[model samples]
Target: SLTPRCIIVRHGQTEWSKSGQYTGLTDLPLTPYGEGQMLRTGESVFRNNQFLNPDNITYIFTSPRLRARQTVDLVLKPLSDEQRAKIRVVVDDDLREWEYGDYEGMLTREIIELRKSRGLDKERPWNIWRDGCENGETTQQIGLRLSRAIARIQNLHRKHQSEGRASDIMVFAHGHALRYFAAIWFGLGVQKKCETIEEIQNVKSYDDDTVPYVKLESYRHLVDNPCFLLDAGGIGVLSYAHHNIDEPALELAGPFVSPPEEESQHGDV
Candidate 1:
């Protein structure tokens, strides 16, 4: 009975994102296409009637990064003045993208080349989930930061619910952080966070149950014109059932991708 519905969206494409470069803490701007994607996101939110009343949305939190902040601003522009007043936009450092550290601005392929030249294993999977970074936080570290942010939000929801206030929340952030957030929300192990896709997804409580479910609501890339690079329209829904009131469930909905082949290879940073 204390469940809250949260709409989590990833920031639109960025220069680094478009170029397959790692963008952690790089502070890049959105590409033209990325801007278009953000506008389309706004349209999707409005057209689908996702927010029944603007006031029902209690909070609008975003990463302090420019791209994430821009996405939030553009998406909220269409809401009415009253709707906007009820929404508080807060920038959270914890929601920042994974700290790529030394690998910032480097592409996965380039990193691989560098490692190979330095006599590291080229065939090994260089993923954040398995190997972490040479000097950066591991998947678990990223998950911890995300879990803290989520805990803060959950506390807000609990307090509002106690006060008989509505409990809807929205967040705009980056890929790595968002993926880890979803994994944490579902109670998945930190290693499993790599299994989450870059696509935009939603986590909601079922109408009849108190458990939280992760639904691949829609692909951010396919909401408007297709991007053609990735299958943005590959709409799929997966649910991770709740095991306990305080923990995520063990059972999960079908149609989810397993861990990547190069589990050690941190692709696209």
Candidate 2:
């Protein structure tokens, strides 16, 4: 099955991320630990015939933020010059983290307290998904930008639909943006709806099914909202079901194959 996969990676830990600060728009470098984390991740995945095989990857999209870009560099460090030459890495502004604006560099608890003192969210606590930051990006705005980014990725994969080769794409971004990208990948907040069995039976085209839409009762209600948590330097996979591009689904557990041993220049230890 040549169904393309989209791999989403969150940037490694920064000082702000470690301190629980809202890290949108604040360009921070990766900590030493974060660098090591990504290096290991690269060694684990970017090998021959592995999940992120450099030969299979067609595009690597990264956020403009320094942290995200740094993570991307470390992630690709394991590839040889020939393997890396085959991939195109694009720095996209649409892949940037949510603009925290007035709430930038503040802790969640501090943001709640600040909002409360400013006569906002008294009825309920501050939720970024619901209330958003003052003068920052709203859920809809993020959805729009992410949708645009996804469209570009989808278009690239579409060209390989008939080919029997892998066309996996990679995205490097911050925590909040990657989570929302997963949501949008499954048709959340988008107007598109999944085709019912009846509709599928009478499909307009050979491959026209839409990604299953995740229904939302209410964004304001904490219980009903979709919660996706990604740790620093963590990775998530999204792929189509049944080898169909329209059937987007989140990959929970991927096959963890033990990487092949490295080639030693000297005698074996």
Candidate 3:
């Protein structure tokens, strides 16, 4: 059986993220704070037990965006020149942030205001699952792209495995895409994509009396058993058994068994 080990990291913060702007394809660089965060992430990985063995990593993959690429550079800088020479840095567009379409560079507040003035329901603005923007990809579309990327990564892993060259893999990417990727990796329904976003957003909008209305945010809470969330900064590692079925691999080795700590951390952009 082929075993795959992956360490996924969300890109450091960006100006748009700090300002709450939709940053799909904006090509913005990291903020000073974000750069610091990336550096800290590198340090954490250097000292942590999960990633102390620098030679254990076989390859490095990053989203095409500046933020993610920058993070990859910073995180891998600790390696010796020879080690760095051996490490492969690959750019994957599918790992990029979910395209915000017409909403690019627009803040949520601005979008809501415009929708209100147009008499459009507040809920109708930027719904990734049901109603996408005028020129945006639907949640399903994004999921398909992510699925393709995951398949490619797995294929690469299998190729290496065939040659007995198995090594841990790392991916640096955006928030929403990473979340959706995780869901798909686990074989969850793509519809759950919207549900996951809504949970993190913490608010839902609807139409009431022909006016946009806001409602308390909600999440479809998973049951206590058979569910877990895990979080690891820049580079986190997990060890688990491979089951007969194909699903998002869960981390079975940890201090707390029920809810993995990694799930709560932010990886979605």
TM-score of each: 0.69, 0.81, 0.69
Give stretches of model 3 more than 4 Å off. Answer: 1-3, 116-126, 190-240, 243-247, 252-269
| Candidate 1 residue 229 C-alpha distance from true site, Å | 13
Report the C-alpha lDDT of model 2 over 155-240, residue by residue, as the tens digit.
Answer: 66766666666788999998888888888787655353324443223221112122222232222111124688899988889876
Per-residue CA lDDT of candidate 1, range 1-269, in tens? 22344556778788778778888888988778888877876766665344334656777667888988888877776787877887777677767877887788999998787767888776764666555566776665555456556655665666676776756577788776665566556545522232344322232211312222233222111011111122111111112222112443222223222322422322231
Tens digits of per-residue lDDT for model 3, 7-108: 678888888787778777889998888888888878767664354446656667678888888888777766788877776777767677778777788987
Residue pairs with backbone overlap in model 2 = none
User: Local distance difference test, per candidate?
Assistant: 0.58, 0.73, 0.59
**lDDT comparing candidate 3 with the true structure:** 0.59
Q: Give the TM-score of candidate 2.
A: 0.81
